[PDB]
Ligand binder design. Structure first.
Ligand code: CHL
Ligand SMILES: CCCCCCCCCCCCCCCCCC(=O)OC[C@H](CO[C@@H]1O[C@H](CO[C@H]2O[C@H](CO)[C@H](O)[C@H](O)[C@H]2O)[C@H](O)[C@H](O)[C@H]1O)OC(=O)CCCCCCCCCCCCCCCCC
Ligand code: CLA
Ligand code: CLA
Ligand code: CLA
Ligand code: CLA
Ligand code: CLA
Ligand SMILES: CCCCCCCCCCCCCCCCCC(=O)OC[C@H](CO[C@@H]1O[C@H](CO)[C@H](O)[C@H](O)[C@H]1O)OC(=O)CCCCCCCCCCCCCCCCC
Ligand SMILES: CC(/C=C/C=C(C)/C=C/[C@@]12O[C@]1(C)C[C@@H](O)CC2(C)C)=C\C=C\C=C(C)\C=C\C=C(C)\C=C\[C@@]12O[C@]1(C)C[C@@H](O)CC2(C)C
Ligand SMILES: CC1=C(/C=C/C(C)=C/C=C/C(C)=C\C=C/C=C(C)/C=C/C=C(C)/C=C/C2=C(C)CCCC2(C)C)C(C)(C)CCC1
Ligand SMILES: CC1=C(/C=C/C(C)=C/C=CC(/C)=C/C=C/C=C(C)\C=C\C=C(C)\C=C\C2=C(C)CCCC2(C)C)C(C)(C)CCC1
Lengths: 97, 42, 193, 154, 198
């Protein structure tokens, strides 16, 4: 009901899940999938300057590598689910058994 | 006789005789049970 | 052998616990698929075995059937009831989030393993009584586990299909109505209305 | 009833169409002599029409708002006589034809000049072969199971 | 002399008289393949045995009730008479039992000898007989399975199958049991035949 409470709780919980539960799984999957490549070379290696990975802002001081991009991602997931909860709880819709 | 049989079994002649017989059979079946739109026996 | 007189698949010898050569569709042809299949089978068997008593025991008591006990959630004021008393945190969004989080964490922790024998039979913290000491007695326990698990899976299938056949009834109710008049009240009326 | 249609026996537009058809046929009859060959032919046609409509009502066909019979082919057991048992009959006859022709082709495939027996049909062999189509449903089934219906190596 | 179904016609080569009842009758050539012949012999055995049992069941009760000993209904209408159990219950029980026994028979047919053993009591196995002819417990009186008796079985089964076909067609066209038809024909054979029936 209280939008701030629900949003903050859900976002913090999603960040906790990303940081402590699914962290290693996601890192392993992104490692094994790798960068997108064309004709065997990555997009940057083919001459696409803008395809270069932004190595600057991706690095972090977190012990395990939790950086900016994944805080954005997990917080976005948390907010999406939080607003789904809020809208659906205040919608007043009721199915009939 | 033998050559008459041979020519009488050549594709066109055999086909025309077969189709004449089939047409006659179907015509008689329709005549006995005309205007049949379903199979009512079972 | 699952079928006296039918030749057995080559990749199923009979050494695995519960191997009876049943694989008509030959799904376990590839060994790396067969290992995952074995783990999945044990997980399903364990869930069904831990569930079926859960479907039956509360029904035997003065509570509703397995489908009525999970109908309170469809109401605007849904609130759960355990052993005849209303639980406090019974409202749906709670139960839902707590269950999702606990199950996700436990399942991920389970999947973070690559033995792959402890993948199916982990042990340690999950074997307090320590029944896995004698390697051959452990094998017969494995056989009994898989057999009872398959039986429980079949029982759960029967429960669900009965529920579909007669909506709003429970397995014990079906058993009681069968015992009331065996011959007339059977599956036949369902098969041939 | 099914698809909002009504039985032809109790339908009204069906009866109206029946009456109109008979009226149209009778209109021509009154012109000729009462007992001439054209009059007899027209009377026979009228009787045929009456019998047809009575039979359609009898078999229990469904009639739409147009007043014409409609065929249900969904599989309803009340209408298997409309498409399913005629369908089975057609499948039997067509498989008879195809199996007999295939048997002939396979039989004549071993000669040095098979084409000669194709433009000039070897009737003696054909008369023996045509009767295999009585039991082709079994011959084809065992042909498939035995694995030689379909040409391997292709 | 293997028995000729057409004195003037030679018998097919694939038929050699080894099988009981081999009279060389196969105009359509349905057994050109040894495997097809091996399957069809078992099919004929089982069909004939079922036909014999069924025709006996339809005939004997009818004549017995006609002469006045038991009061059973006709075979065609015997389905309505209400028994101690619902019809569907009886059907499903029969389905289970037959689904077991017929699969046992099938396993015997596919690879002979693999199902001669009782699956519950490890002893009590069937004597190593031949497909379609499983002796042992199925033959308590132990009548000799001599070849001549097998031919008699085959002939009686063929007669029974013909008789069942006649039973059903006569009931469809006339509308009563076969024995009533025979009695009516005997009363006046020259005015009670298929011609007058049709
Ligand atoms: C295996 C062969 C078998 C055959 C040839 C038949 C043939 C027949 N049964 Mg069965 N039945 C058979 C097996 C069985 N019937 C029944 C239960 C019934 C019932 C309850 C009824 C029939 C009826 C009929 C008749 C359907 C009407 C018809 O065709 O009229 C030509 C028909 C003569 C029906 C009937 O008499 O319809 C007129 C009917 O009511 N059968 C059971 C399980 C109990 C069977 C098990 O094998
Ligand atoms: C009412 C309850 C009881 C029902 C009993 C029903 C029985 C079946 C129905 C009728 C049986 C009587 C038929 C007339 C008797 C003579 C049939 C015959 O032996 O006639 C002789 C032929 C020979 O049969 C087989 O015929 C095959 C083909 O041979 C030959 O086939 C042709 C035969 O003209 C050519 O000669 C050809 O070159 C050659 O390939 C085989 O290879 C063998 O020759 C032979 O075994 O039978 C044939 O099919 C001839 C074609 C008619 C066969 C009809 C079968 C039924 C349909
Ligand atoms: C896919 C096309 C098609 C189909 C499905 C039909 C179907 C039908 N037509 Mg038709 N027709 C067609 C094309 C088609 N037609 C064309 C292109 C023409 C123009 C030439 C015609 C002209 C035509 C006429 C003039 C008539 C029909 C009739 C009929 C019906 C008669 C059934 C019958 O003969 O009794 C049953 C036949 C059998 C059972 C024969 C098989 C039995 C075998 C021989 C024995 C097997 C033993 C085992 C039937 C529903 C007749 C009708 O009355 O319509 C209602 C009729 O009068 N058609
Ligand atoms: C999801 C449950 C599950 C799974 C994953 C397995 C997996 C396995 N089983 Mg098992 N089994 C099960 C349930 C299961 N079983 C049940 C319920 C029974 C009792 C009927 C058995 C009885 C059984 C025997 C007797 C044997 C096996 C064996 C095996 C292994 C080899 C067969 C194989 O590779 O196919 C893999 C199987 C699957 C991928 C599951 C198929 C799922 C498909 C897609 C859907 C099935 C449709 C189903 C009929 C729907 C019913 C619905 C209802 C309305 C009726 C394998 C590891 C053999 C073995 O060697 O054991 C080690 C063996 O002999 N099973
Ligand atoms: C995967 C296994 C499983 C699952 C998912 C469930 C799930 C459920 N059980 Mg159940 N149960 C199980 C196994 C399981 N049970 C077993 C093995 C037994 C035998 C000891 C029982 C005996 C049992 C009883 C007696 C009752 C339930 C009840 C319930 C429902 C409410 C529980 C509650 O109030 O909150 C959770 C409770 C605590 C955490 C404490 C719930 C849907 C209740 C019910 O039926 O609702 C009316 C109830 O009365 N269960
Ligand atoms: C696995 C063990 C098991 C057991 C002990 C039972 C026991 C029972 N079932 Mg059941 N059933 C089962 C599995 C089982 N079923 C499965 C796997 C299915 C899915 C096909 C069904 C589907 C089913 C239906 C639709 C019905 C029953 C019914 C019944 C009850 C009486 C009549 C009957 O047995 O029908 C026969 C049971 C079967 C043919 C199932 C297979 C045989 C098993 C494996 C033994 C009875 C207490 C009837 C009922 O509810 O009583 C009124 C009913 O209508 N069952
Ligand atoms: C299901 C019934 C059935 C079956 C499976 C068989 C099977 C067999 N018969 Mg037999 N036969 C039967 C009925 C049957 N018969 C009846 C009722 C009679 C009395 C008229 C005979 C009289 C008979 C004789 C005299 C001979 C055979 C022979 C044979 C064997 C060789 C011919 C063959 O393989 O063709 C395959 C036959 C079938 C697949 C049966 C098909 C039935 C059709 C498709 C239905 C007909 C519908 C009907 C007209 C209505 C074979 C194993 C010959 C043999 O070698 O003896 C062992 C032999 O000489 N039969
Ligand atoms: C009722 C309508 C459905 C009828 C289905 C009939 C049975 C189909 C399954 C059996 C098919 C079959 O055995 O042949 C299967 C056929 C070939 O058939 C196979 O031939 C092999 C080589 O000669 C062997 O002889 C096998 O015994 C034979 O089955 O191939 C396929 O159709 C591919 C399917 C997978 C095999
Ligand atoms: C199985 C069978 C009958 C079984 C009957 C049963 C169980 C009846 C049961 C009941 O009655 C009771 C007891 C009590 C009743 O109240 C109820 C019912 C339920 C009704 C008959 C088979 C009957 C089978 C028949 C008639 C088969 C005929 C086959 C023929 C003629 C084939 C001939 C040829 O095949 C050859 C041999 C060679 C080929 O090359 C050429 C051709 C010509 C094709
Ligand atoms: C320092 C640190 C810490 C902490 C920290 C924090 C707490 C922070 C943060 C943060 C956060 C917490 C973040 C977040 C998030 C993010 C983002 C980036 C997001 C998002 C979302 C979105 C964007 C959405 C949108 C939408 C829309 C608009 C539409 C509709 C609705 C929705 C929702 C869908 C600690 C002490 C623990 C430890 C050490 C380190
Ligand atoms: C029931 C029905 C229906 C439907 C159905 C369906 C949809 C199904 C199917 C089907 C299918 C899916 C089929 C298939 C097939 C396949 C294949 C693969 C095959 C084959 C065959 C062959 C190949 C043959 C050959 C031959 C013969 C045998 C004949 C003659 C000779 C020859 C050689 C030609 C409907 C509803 C409409 C209506 C009603 C009826």
């Amino acid at each position: 009901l209280n939008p701030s409470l629900v949003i903050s709780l859900s976002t913090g919980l999603s960040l906790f899940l990303g940081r402590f539960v699914f962290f290693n799984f996601q890192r392993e999957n992104v490692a094994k999938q790798g960068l997108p490549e064309q004709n065997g070379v990555t997009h940057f290696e083919a001459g696409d300057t803008r395809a270069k990975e932004y190595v600057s802002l991706l690095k972090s001081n977190d012990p395990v590598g939790f950086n900016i991009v994944d805080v954005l991602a997990w917080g976005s997931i948390g907010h999406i689910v939080a607003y789904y909860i809020l809208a659906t709880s205040s919608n007043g819709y009721d199915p009939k058994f | 006789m033998r050559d008459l049989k041979t020519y009488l079994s050549v594709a066109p002649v055999a086909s025309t005789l077969w189709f004449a017989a089939l047409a006659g059979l179907l015509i008689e079946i329709n005549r006995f049970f005309p205007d049949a739109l379903t199979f009512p026996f079972f | 052998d699952w079928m006296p007189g039918q030749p057995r698949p080559s990749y199923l010898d009979g050494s695995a616990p519960g191997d009876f050569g049943f694989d008509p569709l030959r799904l376990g042809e590839v060994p790396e698929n067969l290992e995952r299949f074995k783990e999945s089978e044990l997980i399903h068997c364990r869930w069904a075995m831990l569930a079926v008593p859960g479907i039956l025991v509360p029904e035997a008591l003065g509570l509703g059937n397995w489908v009525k006990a999970q109908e309170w959630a469809a109401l605007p004021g849904g609130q759960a009831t355990y052993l005849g008393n209303p639980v406090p945190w019974g409202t749906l969004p709670t139960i839902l989030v707590i269950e999702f989080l606990s199950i996700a964490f436990v399942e991920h922790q389970r999947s973070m393993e690559k033995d792959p024998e402890k993948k199916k039979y982990p042990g340690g913290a999950f074997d307090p009584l320590g029944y896995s000491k004698d390697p051959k007695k452990f094998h017969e326990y494995k056989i009994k586990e898989v057999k009872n698990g398959r039986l429980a899976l079949l029982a759960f299938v029967g429960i669900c299909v009965q529920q579909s056949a007669y909506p709003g009834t429970g397995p014990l109710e079906n058993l009681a109505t069968h015992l009331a008049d065996p011959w007339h009240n059977t599956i036949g009326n369902v098969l041939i209305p | 009833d099914i698809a909002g249609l009504t039985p032809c026996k109790d339908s009204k537009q069906f009866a109206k169409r029946e009456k109109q058809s008979i009226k149209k046929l009778e209109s021509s009859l009154k012109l000729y002599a009462p007992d001439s060959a054209p009059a007899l032919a027209i009377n026979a046609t009228i009787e045929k029409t009456k019998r047809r409509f009575d039979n359609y009502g009898k078999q229990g066909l469904l009639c739409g708002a147009d007043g014409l019979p409609h065929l249900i082919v969904s599989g309803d057991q009340r209408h298997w006589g409309e498409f399913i048992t005629p369908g089975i009959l057609f499948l039997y006859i067509a498989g008879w034809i195809g199996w007999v022709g295939r048997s002939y082709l396979i039989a004549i495939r071993d000669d040095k000049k098979p084409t000669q027996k194709e433009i000039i049909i070897d009737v003696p062999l054909a008369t023996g072969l045509v009767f295999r189509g009585f039991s082709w449903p079994i011959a084809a089934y065992r042909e498939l199971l035995n694995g030689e219906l379909v040409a391997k190596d292709v | 002399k293997k028995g000729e179904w057409l004195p003037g016609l030679a018998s097919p080569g694939y038929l050699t008289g080894s099988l009981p009842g081999d009279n060389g009758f196969d105009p359509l050539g349905l057994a050109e393949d040894p495997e097809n012949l091996k399957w069809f012999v078992q099919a004929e055995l089982v069909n004939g045995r079922w036909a014999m049992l069924g025709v006996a069941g339809m005939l004997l009760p009818e004549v017995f009730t006609s002469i006045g000993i038991i009061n059973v209904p006709k075979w065609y209408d015997a389905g309505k008479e209400e028994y101690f159990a619902s019809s569907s219950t009886l059907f499903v029980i029969e389905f289970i039992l037959f689904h077991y026994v017929e699969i046992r028979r099938w396993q015997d047919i596919k690879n002979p000898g693999s199902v001669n053993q009782d699956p519950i009591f490890k002893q009590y196995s069937l004597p190593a007989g031949e497909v379609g002819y499983p002796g042992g417990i199925f033959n308590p009186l132990n009548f000799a399975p001599t070849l001549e008796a097998k031919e008699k079985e085959i002939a009686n089964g063929r007669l029974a199958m013909l008789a069942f076909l006649g039973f059903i067609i006569q009931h469809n066209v006339t509308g009563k049991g076969p024995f009533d038809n025979l009695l009516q024909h005997i009363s006046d054979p020259w005015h009670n035949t298929i011609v007058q029936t049709l």
